[PDB]
Amino acid sequence: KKHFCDIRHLDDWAKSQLIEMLKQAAALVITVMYTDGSTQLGADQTPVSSVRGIVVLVKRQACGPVLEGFVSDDPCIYIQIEHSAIWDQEQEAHQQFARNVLFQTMKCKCPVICFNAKDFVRIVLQFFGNDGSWKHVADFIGLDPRIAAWLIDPSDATPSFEDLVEKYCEKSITVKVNSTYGNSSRNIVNQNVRENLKTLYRLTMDLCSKLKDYGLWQLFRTLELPLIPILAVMESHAIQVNKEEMEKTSALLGARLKELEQEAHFVAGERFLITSNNQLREILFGKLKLHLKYPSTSEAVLNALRDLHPLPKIILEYRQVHKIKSTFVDGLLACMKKGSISSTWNQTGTVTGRLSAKHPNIQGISKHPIQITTPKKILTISPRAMFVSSKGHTFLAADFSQIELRILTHLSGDPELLKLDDVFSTLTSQWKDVPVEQVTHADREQTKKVVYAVVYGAGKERLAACVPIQEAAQFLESFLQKYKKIKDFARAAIAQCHQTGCVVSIMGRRRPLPRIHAHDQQLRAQAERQAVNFVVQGSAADLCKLAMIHVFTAVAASHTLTARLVAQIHDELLFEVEDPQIPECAALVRRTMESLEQVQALELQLQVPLKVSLSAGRSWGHLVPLQ
DNA sequence: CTAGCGTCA
DNA sequence: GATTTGACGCTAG
Numbered sequence A: 001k002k003h004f005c006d007i008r009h010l011d012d013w014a015k016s017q018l019i020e021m022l023k024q025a026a027a028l029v030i031t032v033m034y035t036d037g038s039t040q041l042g043a044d045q046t047p048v049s050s051v052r053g054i055v056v057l058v059k060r061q062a063c064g065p066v067l068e069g070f071v072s073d074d075p076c077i078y079i080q081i082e083h084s085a086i087w088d089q090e091q092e093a094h095q096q097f098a099r100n101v102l103f104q105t106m107k108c109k110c111p112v113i114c115f116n117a118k119d120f121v122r123i124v125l126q127f128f129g130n131d132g133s134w135k136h137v138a139d140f141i142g143l144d145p146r147i148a149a150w151l152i153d154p155s156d157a158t159p160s161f162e163d164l165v166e167k168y169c170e171k172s173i174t175v176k177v178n179s180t181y182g183n184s185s186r187n188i189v190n191q192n193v194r195e196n197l198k199t200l201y202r203l204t205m206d207l208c209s210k211l212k213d214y215g216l217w218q219l220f221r222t223l224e225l226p227l228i229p230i231l232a233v234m235e236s237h238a239i240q241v242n243k244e245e246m247e248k249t250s251a252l253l254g255a256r257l258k259e260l261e262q263e264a265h266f267v268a269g270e271r272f273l274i275t276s277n278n279q280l281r282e283i284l285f286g287k288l289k290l291h292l293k294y295p296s297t298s299e300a301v302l303n304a305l306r307d308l309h310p311l312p313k314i315i316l317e318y319r320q321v322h323k324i325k326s327t328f329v330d331g332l333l334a335c336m337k338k339g340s341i342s343s344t345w346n347q348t349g350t351v352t353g354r355l356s357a358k359h360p361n362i363q364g365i366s367k368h369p370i371q372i373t374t375p376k377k378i379l380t381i382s383p384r385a386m387f388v389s390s391k392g393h394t395f396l397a398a399d400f401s402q403i404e405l406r407i408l409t410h411l412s413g414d415p416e417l418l419k420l421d422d423v424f425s426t427l428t429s430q431w432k433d434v435p436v437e438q439v440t441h442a443d444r445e446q447t448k449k450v451v452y453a454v455v456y457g458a459g460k461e462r463l464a465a466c467v468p469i470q471e472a473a474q475f476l477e478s479f480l481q482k483y484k485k486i487k488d489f490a491r492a493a494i495a496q497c498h499q500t501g502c503v504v505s506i507m508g509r510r511r512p513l514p515r516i517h518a519h520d521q522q523l524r525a526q527a528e529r530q531a532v533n534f535v536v537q538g539s540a541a542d543l544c545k546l547a548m549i550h551v552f553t554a555v556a557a558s559h560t561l562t563a564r565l566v567a568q569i570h571d572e573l574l575f576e577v578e579d580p581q582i583p584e585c586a587a588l589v590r591r592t593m594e595s596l597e598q599v600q601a602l603e604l605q606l607q608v609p610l611k612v613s614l615s616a617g618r619s620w621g622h623l624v625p626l627q
Numbered sequence B: 001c002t003a004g005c006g007t008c009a
Numbered sequence C: 001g002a003t004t005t006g007a008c009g010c011t012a013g
Helices: A012-024 A089-107 A117-128 A145-152 A161-168 A186-214 A217-234 A243-268 A277-287 A299-304 A311-335 A403-412 A415-419 A423-432 A441-455 A460-465 A469-482 A484-500 A521-556 A579-598
Strands: A027-034 A051-059 A076-080 A112-114 A239-241 A344-346 A356-358 A393-400 A502-504 A510-512 A564-569 A572-578 A612-617
Touching: A012 A051, A012 A089, A027 A117, A027 A186, A051 A117, A051 A186, A076 A089, A076 A186, A089 A117, A112 A186, A117 A217, A145 A161, A145 A186, A145 A217, A161 A186, A186 A217, A217 A521, A217 A564, A243 A311, A277 A311, A299 A311, A393 A521, A393 A579, A403 A415, A403 A441, A403 A484, A403 A521, A415 A484, A423 A441, A441 A460, A441 A469, A460 A469, A469 A484, A484 A502, A484 A521, A502 A521, A510 A521, A521 A564, A521 A572, A521 A579, A572 A579, A579 A612
Parallel strands: A027 A112
Antiparallel strands: A027 A051, A051 A076, A344 A356, A393 A572, A393 A612, A502 A510, A564 A572
């Protein structure tokens, strides 16, 4: 009441006094609040509306007394984001003050506790706009218990607020979190927000001491929390896609679809709906009686009917082409706004530490383009080539070479591995027993896959699968005997997992795998394979994340350099650099991402060096190596 | 072999 | 009639 403070109704002395307070504060507890009003605090992470405000509970202790006269203790500041209909002078005043307060919030020296902070920072930048840029949020550190939770038990499906409090609090602190407008009145929503905010504070301190207890603290503070405003930045920009050519690929794919639909009717002898599995089941078995109740339309069955009638193949083809148009063309086109796409990045996304992305999945778009048969000439679909730098600018893309293999060397310690101008060709040529130059990309494509599969515990079965089955047991031993230390490393990770129940990456990231003790043998074996994988891939995720923070701060503070970091494929950062600035940018990126070997500074000493690999180009599809 | 997201029957 | 699963499709090592 005086415990919910609307800065817009503050008089002029106390505006200055309020920012003074935000500086002096021992803690700030923030959350966004939507037009509902709900908060992210939270309702399934879908409050169903655009944003209106930010609520900041200021804990003036967490010396002597403090009484401001304009507030209660501890006050809750209410910062109005929402634009009114028409835009005039005092509103300009108000918004300037809001911008001012929010800026202070980002930069201040005490702990700042926020839940889905990335969301917060992204919203503040939308609001901030041109009035302050994306580097005035890079230093921002704020404590997001969704992340602390995810660090502690990574498996756990990324939780709501409730779940977390009732789990991690002592004792019986609580929330009234349902509150909306129209579900409730004004007072209900706002007093519930202050209460939920004191709650979120305690949830958070408790989670912190948990981290310190599990040795996940240094990991939290140095890798994850600084990564937060970086992800927030990438969401605030968007990559441009080639609209005309995109819509043309949809036109291409569209035809062959209508054409395949036509051939299907003809052979079937009736004009039916080809997308309907029912009618096609009625046709294949109702009418053509191909079985001699009905089996299904699944792809195994239709494959079995390949001979009998010419219906199946046409169907399967319609289906494959339909999958292509939908995922590659129609899906991406659903995502665009203004001819641009920007994925949401999920830091709690996986168990190994890697990030993940939705809408679209930018870590999922295929490397190599694909073929659909163009009917009434030679052309293709490449989905990546539909992502383009705006003009004049060029994508620079920096990438860690064979990073998991390098880590595997650092961990195992293998001499024959360490001894080992592009590495993969060399086993690709030994398989080939050839001179480097004539080995095709597909051979490296199968060779690298061969190595990954064999290092992670793959039986001779799938190894042969990806070729004679007995022949390869032969390959495998050849491989495992070549490098003994890789077997010793796996044996080590596995043994430590049975020993402690979890296993830990280079930087402290943990993967509990309790089924290591599980009596069932396929389960036990899975947990083992998983552990051995995790130490490696978890470590690589740690490294990539570090590289991303360092590189991002390097580009952040430069007077000359304009480069915006745009996206991250797992091992590869991708920047959009202003055109003349590629050589400068490539230089910085190189320098920075290599220098990692010692920035812990030196906790982390890589017995094998990190080589970045730089590429550049106007479109994401065509990027020439540069060197 | 290990991690993800996206499209379906 | 609508709605959620487990295969397989791609991705990254």
